[PDB]
């Protein structure tokens, strides 16, 4: 709180972020000399952490905000993971109190960046990255319906969401396996008792969800509450049967997807 009320620190953070953007986009103005790269490396990290914190106190970001542009450039460039997660948190915190109709920072998110974040959704071996992407998308489509339209305008984002969300519902919760049954063969028990064949093996059911599944459920519930005859509501209808399969396999999913099943 004391740091935010200081123009010098914020100006320094912005300066370092613009230098990082110049490194990321590959500008010919300022080219880092690799003999110094080490220093720069450490520098960048600290700056981003600072940004993350103060990102909560500049919450409504306007249209031509330099922080947002710098962060999206760095996000499209970097290969670090700590950096990607920090940038996603910082971006999701710069969209807290923003209107959909009013011109805001969310108009600086071209289809490339949204496609990149949904691609992050497409991964499987990183729960934290998936949760960060889902939190960002939740905060994105939260204030209104025009942002849902802008999100589903892109064909790639639409396809990836449609293929990913139902499978994210059953993410790491050990569904009942119907393959032991197909592999189990039926014979006669060797051996005065009458001849039984054998007992079909049992089938267990999961009793609790994972964090990724809970976040996906909340996202679907939020997405279902949009006005019909508009995108986002047609998405749920295109997605329903796979969700029905998932619900048949997981009861806590039926308890958790109540708002989704109400508005469908």
């Amino acid at each position: 709180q004391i740091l935010v009320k200081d123009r010098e620190i914020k100006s320094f953070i912005l300066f370092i972020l613009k230098k990082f953007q110049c490194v990321a986009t590959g500008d010919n103005k300022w080219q880092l000399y690799e003999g110094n790269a080490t220093f720069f490396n450490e520098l960048t990290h600290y700056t981003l952490d600072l940004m993350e914190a103060i990102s909560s106190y500049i919450a409504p970001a306007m249209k031509d905000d330099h922080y947002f542009q710098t962060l999206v450039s760095i996000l499209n460039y970097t290969k670090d993971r700590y950096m990607v997660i920090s940038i996603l948190r910082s971006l999701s915190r710069l969209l807290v109190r923003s209107k959909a109709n009013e011109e805001s920072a969310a108009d600086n998110l071209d289809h490339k960046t949204l496609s990149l974040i949904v691609s992050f959704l497409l991964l499987e071996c990183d729960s934290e990255l998936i949760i960060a992407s889902l939190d960002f998308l939740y905060q994105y489509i939260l204030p209104g319906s025009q942002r849902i339209t802008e999100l589903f305008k892109s064909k790639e984002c639409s396809l990836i969401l449609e293929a990913t969300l139902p499978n994210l519902l059953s993410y790491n919760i050990a569904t009942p396996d119907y393959h032991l049954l197909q592999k189990h063969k039926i014979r006669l028990i060797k051996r005065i008792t009458p001849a039984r064949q054998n007992s079909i093996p049992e089938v267990k059911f999961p009793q609790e969800l994972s964090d990724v599944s809970k976040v996906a459920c909340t996202f679907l519930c939020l997405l279902s509450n949009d006005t019909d005859d508009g995108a986002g509501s047609a998405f749920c209808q295109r997605i329903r049967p796979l969700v029905l399969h998932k619900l048949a396999d997981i009861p806590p999913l039926t308890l958790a997807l109540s708002e989704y099943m109400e508005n469908t």
Binding site: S56, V96, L142
Partner: peptide
């Protein structure tokens, strides 16, 4: 070590979500 969920961030998130839910109730 970073604090993943600050107090003010959580408070603002809850407040905004409650406000939007109340708007939808209207």
């Amino acid at each position: 070590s970073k604090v993943i969920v600050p107090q003010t961030v959580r408070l603002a998130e809850e407040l905004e979500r409650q406000q939007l839910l109340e708007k939808r109730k209207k």
